Amino acid sequence: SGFRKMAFPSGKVEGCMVQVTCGTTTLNGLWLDDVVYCPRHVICTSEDMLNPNYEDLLIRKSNHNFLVQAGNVQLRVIGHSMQNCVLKLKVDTANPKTPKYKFVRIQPGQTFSVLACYNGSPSGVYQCAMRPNFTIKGSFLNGSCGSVGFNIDYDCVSFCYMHHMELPTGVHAGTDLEGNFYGPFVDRQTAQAAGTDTTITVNVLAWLYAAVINGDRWFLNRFTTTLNDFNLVAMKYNYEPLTQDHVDILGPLSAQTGIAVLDMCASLKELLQNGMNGRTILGSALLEDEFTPFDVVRQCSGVTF
Amino acid sequence: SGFRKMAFPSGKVEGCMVQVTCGTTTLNGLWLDDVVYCPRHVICTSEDMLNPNYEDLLIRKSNHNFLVQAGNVQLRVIGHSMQNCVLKLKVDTANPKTPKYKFVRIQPGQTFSVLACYNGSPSGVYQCAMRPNFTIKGSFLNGSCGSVGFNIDYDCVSFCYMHHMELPTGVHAGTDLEGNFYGPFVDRQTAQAAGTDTTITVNVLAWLYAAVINGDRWFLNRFTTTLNDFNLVAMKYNYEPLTQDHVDILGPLSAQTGIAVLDMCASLKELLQNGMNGRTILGSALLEDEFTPFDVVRQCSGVTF
Numbered sequence: 001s002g003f004r005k006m007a008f009p010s011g012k013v014e015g016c017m018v019q020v021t022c023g024t025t026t027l028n029g030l031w032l033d034d035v036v037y038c039p040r041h042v043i044c045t046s047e048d049m050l051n052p053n054y055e056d057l058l059i060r061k062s063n064h065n066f067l068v069q070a071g072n073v074q075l076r077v078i079g080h081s082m083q084n085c086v087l088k089l090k091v092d093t094a095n096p097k098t099p100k101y102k103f104v105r106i107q108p109g110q111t112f113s114v115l116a117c118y119n120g121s122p123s124g125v126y127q128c129a130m131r132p133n134f135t136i137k138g139s140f141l142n143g144s145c146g147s148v149g150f151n152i153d154y155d156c157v158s159f160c161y162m163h164h165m166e167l168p169t170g171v172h173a174g175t176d177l178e179g180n181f182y183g184p185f186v187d188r189q190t191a192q193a194a195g196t197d198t199t200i201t202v203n204v205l206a207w208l209y210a211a212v213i214n215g216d217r218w219f220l221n222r223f224t225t226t227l228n229d230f231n232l233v234a235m236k237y238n239y240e241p242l243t244q245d246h247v248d249i250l251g252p253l254s255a256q257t258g259i260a261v262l263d264m265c266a267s268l269k270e271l272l273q274n275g276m277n278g279r280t281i282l283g284s285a286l287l288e289d290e291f292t293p294f295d296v297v298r299q300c301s302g303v304t305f
Numbered sequence: 306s307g308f309r310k311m312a313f314p315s316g317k318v319e320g321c322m323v324q325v326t327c328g329t330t331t332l333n334g335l336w337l338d339d340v341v342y343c344p345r346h347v348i349c350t351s352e353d354m355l356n357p358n359y360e361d362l363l364i365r366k367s368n369h370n371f372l373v374q375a376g377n378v379q380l381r382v383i384g385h386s387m388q389n390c391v392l393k394l395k396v397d398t399a400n401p402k403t404p405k406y407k408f409v410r411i412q413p414g415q416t417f418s419v420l421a422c423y424n425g426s427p428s429g430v431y432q433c434a435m436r437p438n439f440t441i442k443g444s445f446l447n448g449s450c451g452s453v454g455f456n457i458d459y460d461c462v463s464f465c466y467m468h469h470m471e472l473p474t475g476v477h478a479g480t481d482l483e484g485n486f487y488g489p490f491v492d493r494q495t496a497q498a499a500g501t502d503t504t505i506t507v508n509v510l511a512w513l514y515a516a517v518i519n520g521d522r523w524f525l526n527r528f529t530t531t532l533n534d535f536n537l538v539a540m541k542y543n544y545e546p547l548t549q550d551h552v553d554i555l556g557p558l559s560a561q562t563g564i565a566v567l568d569m570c571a572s573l574k575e576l577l578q579n580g581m582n583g584r585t586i587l588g589s590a591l592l593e594d595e596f597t598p599f600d601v602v603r604q605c606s607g608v609t610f
């Protein structure tokens with residue numbers, strides 16, 4: 001028993017991290033097969049970031065302007081292209097530690113592990129959710145750019161995030177591994193802001209199910225609700241709409257605990273209206289929304305990799 | 306910027322995890338050089354667990370009663386000894402993935418990473434503190450026994466914890482890698498209980514310094530305190546005493562932020578008196594006590610491995 005914010009073991013991804021330097025700019029790259037993926041802003045100075053023309057900045061660069069260090073080994077760049085906001089450096093050596101992997105674009109509410117790196121070296125691993133406003137609440141200092149987010153399914157690494165930017169509120173923005181930004185952000189140093197965030201309703205319900213599995217049930221009640229009546233209340237508290245697809249996704253947790261999804265919704269409705277009344281759930285005074293239904297089943301049933 | 310509960314990258318430890326079976330009992334072992342370390346209760350049935358004599362249970366076993374699996378490879382056991390509550394299985398082949406490592410015993414308040422494993426396969430990694438009552442608030446199902454806790458300094462893995470047991474409150478107990486229990490716990494299914502836990506005061510102070518470094522000072526005040534007046538107040542909230550050694554350990558964070566340790570203590574005193582009044586500190590509605598002063602500097606300055 002017990003419930004922790006739990007990252008995927010980072011070993012398969014640690015074997016893929018490299019350092020990329022272009023002029024005075026150093027950041028992290030992801031080395032898979034014979035390609036290194038990094039943020040295209042590696043080709044910018046701080047001055048260039050104000051109004052960069054990436055096409056123009058890139059065409060002035062040759063293969064040998066890009067220094068890739070795997071750890072102690074210099075990789076030779078033999079080619080480069082831009083895909084959206086990521087630079088692809090073709091290198092002379094395929095990564096022997098290349099795991100089974102795909103590139104996936106995740107939806108808001110989905111969680112992943114971040115391996116925070118500096119100079120191609122990992123400093124640590126933590127769990128993040130893609131917020132409904134397409135930001136993540138990460139821990140990233142300057143030099144963390146090119147750090148990646150991922151899930152592991154059996155032996156297959158699903159890379160979903162590459163780190164590009166910190167917004168003024170101290171939250172973080174980046175791309176999928178095809179270089180498409182999550183959220184309405186651009187890789188220029190211009191005024192940009194996180195939108196008003198909302199609570200990931202399906203995740204709060206998953207976490208209430210986690211609480212029940214772990215022996216906390218004070219918040220359960222004898223009431224039920226329609227999906228529609230639930231959403232009419234939850235919307236007022238800046239909670240994301242709960243869909244029938246969310247309800248279906250919560251099926252396994254509902255079956256395991258014997259609490260119907262709409263009954264857990266009735267519990268959450270009451271919690272939003274009344275607060276906790278000085279009580280806590282799984283050691284939190286707040287309703288936690290950064291655990292998916294899958295995160296709860298995976299942790300509460302011990303699935304391995 | 307940002308501050309997250311961050312685990313060490315788990316790769317070096319993932320390479321050391323194996324499955325150990327003795328009869329009907331399967332758990333996790335740590336394979337370093339040509340020895341596999343596991344909880345000595347691998348040689349027990351559930352029936353044996355009330356009052357086992359491990360010397361007597363062990364002498365009745367041959368090398369070939371121990372099945373050690375490193376993924377798909379059967380390791381041959383060519384010897385065994387017991388050191389306190391750990392079994393050391395000598396095997397025919399040294400682990401080629403053996404990292405630079407040592408065995409360390411940590412103090413209460415010190416943090417480490419846990420790689421939760423089942424059947425010798427890692428399921429995930431999270432950050433834990435050795436509680437003042439010598440338990441950890443982990444996430445462990447049956448089969449997690451032999452999962453290890455560790456710190457990384459550069460390339461050197463310091464193994465500090467092996468998982469043995471869940472107590473009735475759903476908290477966890479185990480040993481150092483020399484098989485000496487943290488706390489008064491014994492590897493028998495006898496009635497045992499976590500003692501009254503306390504808050505790790507020096508860690509809460511480190512985390513308030515983390516909040517300041519990350520741009521939040523709403524909780525500061527104009528006041529100071531004597532160490533002794535601080536301890537007289539904090540004790541009433543079930544906080545561990547703050548020692549002069551704790552004050553010294555906080556020196557670097559105090560110098561970085563320009564906030565005197567005793568001034569931060571005055572802030573904590575007020576936070577205990579007032580609560581948050583619907584605010585948060587680094588995204589928490591509670592005072593976090595599972596970051597050491599070292600954890601804060603490491604994360605806020607971007608140390609790599």
Ligand SMILES: CSc1ccc(N(Cc2cc(Cl)cs2)C(=O)Cc2cncc3ccccc23)cc1
Nearest residue numbers: 041044046140141142164165166187188189306
């Ligand atoms: C090549 S030069 C360069 C200079 C600054 C940054 N920026 C600003 C911007 C990035 C984007 Cl994309 C648009 S503006 C960052 O946001 C980078 C950073 C990331 N994560 C954490 C950060 C923490 C502190 C400072 C910068 C951080 C990027 C590259």
Ligand SMILES: CSc1ccc(N(Cc2cc(Cl)cs2)C(=O)Cc2cncc3ccccc23)cc1
Nearest residue numbers: 001346349350445446447469470471492493494
């Ligand atoms: C050989 S058979 C065997 C059967 C049960 C357990 N126990 C009970 C005890 C351990 C100790 Cl040491 C003394 S009693 C555990 O606590 C094992 C477990 C661990 N961590 C999390 C657990 C969660 C649920 C159930 C058991 C868990 C040990 C060996």
